[PDB]
């Protein structure tokens, strides 16, 4: 399947990108003017290569058992990671044309930015999620070593090795913390909080342009016995919803079984169609697992100066539409 | 008061440290070999200086109204920040003795590590906590600009300015996310999760040395009417508990009104004394606010190979001691 290929290619891309970053650092180490700098770059190289083993383990494991790869908007994520590779290669070529410590510094920082891409941590958390939390990096223990070295002699190189290690690990922790805060583990859509943080910023831009925006709330009903497979339904539906999204639209977890989508720009003329086609897709693409009934409530509007108040209002309106669609559901898609 | 002075000196120290970092970056900009590098360092300088205004605003505001400054272990935090200053000054002196792009790179990275100290975000969150969440930095929007620049000409400098800005803001986000994950907003002690992540690592070291460790659970009872000031009691008690801690001991929020302390090393002979003296301190230091009754349960032991299981067990034992101290509280301090 093209979708499976994509997920496999994202795992491969993350693996290649950390390897490539490691390679570039090794090149900086070989070009370094001092032992201090050489060992800094070698340590960062080593830490980055060691870290990349996570993706290797995902590939190995994924060849022994069916291992769900959970990624926010796979197609767009793969294109971003390929383009990151392309930019790195261009910058490495610029470096090769005129190597210097200064060029290495700037490209090192660019790598530090680029490899913050959410995909990396979205994959790293797969096994941690499996069985439990993030390890203590010990900022404080690193600090104490630097403090105890104040006034030392002969330890410039041991310190830059420590700096390289502390920095890789705290930077990596930052990736993992961002992922835990912004993205849902189970489905890969945004967390509720991440969704509203992302939408806040988009909404301010919407307000400035006078764009129509929308909030859509999607509730799933699947057969239940009275009083695991809900989880699996959620993953599949998240994929269906995600396939209906443009680059400008955002999906998140709203309520526990419930999804929220931010639509921008909205053409009011075509909103009923988009919502109805999502409902049909959700239900038809779920046949081969367990039948699911989707109820969808959607509200749209143009935001005033109180942007937060506006988004709040649309959520409130969408929710009353959702209540109708669920319970007074003559239609299971209610638009306003 | 010495304690108030300390908090004020921590605010001053954070302000000075970001200013100093900004200063060092401006110096790198003046020494830069290329326009590309000059503008990178100037942008990082500017972003860091702009950010430091947060601490200025805390000082201004704190001179107009009583503004609680909430810091984990103030005395130790101040010493760490002073030592960070001292190390920076030593490294700047080493740089001054032999300036180069390579020396600047390494010192830039050292600043990036050092200024991750928890104190910075513990102060930044004071006003955000006041009224609501972290702003979207837009990693994705920065990325799209870099991707759209692939193959460009004449934009090397605009890109390094963008890189400097993206990096400061995402690094700053990392500080704020770490704080939200690891430290309690109200009291400044560790979050429950942060406490166990920190304790996990300490416990592994304890197990290797065969050290006795302890878990103490502290429950507060203060006068209530049937069915705000609880918050204020919590802050004061957190300060009392914190004044009884050695450098090796950790305090966190456990249950909502309840504190957890990790003690290491424990001398079983002196555990009843430490717990009883904490109870007395808590109750006596709370006279001038609202009388508080403290119940304390504490368990101690030597950890086996299953370190997580060991810490779990001590928490379980401490909790049964706490239940006695509260309810079968012939003694309000129960030790095992």
TrEMBL record, chains A, B:
InterPro entries: Diguanylate_Cyclase (IPR050469), Ferritin-like (IPR012347), Ferritin-like_SF (IPR009078), GGDEF_dom (IPR000160), Nucleotide_cyclase (IPR029787), Rev_trsase/Diguanyl_cyclase (IPR043128). Residues 211-336 form the GGDEF domain. One of its GO terms (molecular function) is diguanylate cyclase activity. GO terms for biological process: cell adhesion involved in single-species biofilm formation; negative regulation of bacterial-type flagellum-dependent cell motility. Its EC number is 2.7.7.65. It holds the Pfam family GGDEF. One of its GO terms (cellular component) is plasma membrane. It catalyses: 2 GTP = 3',3'-c-di-GMP + 2 diphosphate. SUPFAM superfamilies: Ferritin-like, Nucleotide cyclase. This is diguanylate cyclase.
């Amino acid at each position: 399947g093209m979708s499976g290929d994509i997920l496999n290619d994202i795992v491969a891309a993350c693996l290649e990108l950390e390897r490539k970053a490691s390679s570039v650092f090794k090149m900086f180490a070989a070009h370094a003017g001092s032992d201090e700098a050489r060992r800094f770059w070698e340590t960062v190289a080593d830490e980055t290569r060691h870290h990349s083993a996570v993706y290797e383990r995902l590939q190995e494991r994924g060849g022994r058992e069916n291992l769900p790869i959970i990624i926010y908007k796979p197609a767009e994520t793969l294109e971003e990671l390929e383009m990151i590779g392309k930019s790195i290669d261009e910058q490495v070529e610029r470096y090769t044309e005129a190597p210097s410590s200064e060029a290495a510094c700037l490209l090192g920082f660019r790598l530090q930015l680029y490899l913050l891409h959410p995909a990396f941590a979205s994959l790293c958390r797969l096994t941690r999620d499996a069985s439990e939390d993030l390890p203590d990096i010990g900022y404080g223990r690193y600090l104490r070593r630097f403090i105890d070295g104040i006034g030392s002699c002969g330890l410039a190189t041991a310190e830059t090795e420590l700096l390289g290690e502390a920095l890789f690990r705290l930077w990596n922790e930052a990736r993992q913390l961002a992922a835990q805060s912004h993205f849902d583990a189970l489905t890969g859509v945004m967390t509720r909080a991440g969704f509203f943080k992302t939408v806040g910023s988009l909404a301010y831009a919407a307000q400035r342009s006078g764009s129509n925006v929308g909030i859509m709330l999607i509730d799933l009903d699947y057969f239940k016995l009275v009083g695991q497979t809900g989880d699996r339904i959620l993953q599949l539906v998240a994929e269906t919803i995600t396939s209906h999204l443009r680059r400008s639209d955002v999906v998140g977890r709203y309520d526990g079984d419930e999804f929220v989508v931010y639509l921008s720009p909205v053409e009011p003329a075509s909103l009923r169609t988009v919502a109805e086609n999502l409902r049909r897709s959700i239900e038809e693409e779920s046949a081969r697992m367990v039948p699911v009934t989707a109820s969808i409530g959607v509200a749209q509007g143009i935001l005033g100066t109180d942007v937060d108040g506006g988004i709040e209002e649309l959520v409130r309106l969408a929710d009353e539409c959702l209540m109708q669609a669920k319970y007074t559901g003559k239609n299971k898609v209610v638009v306003k």
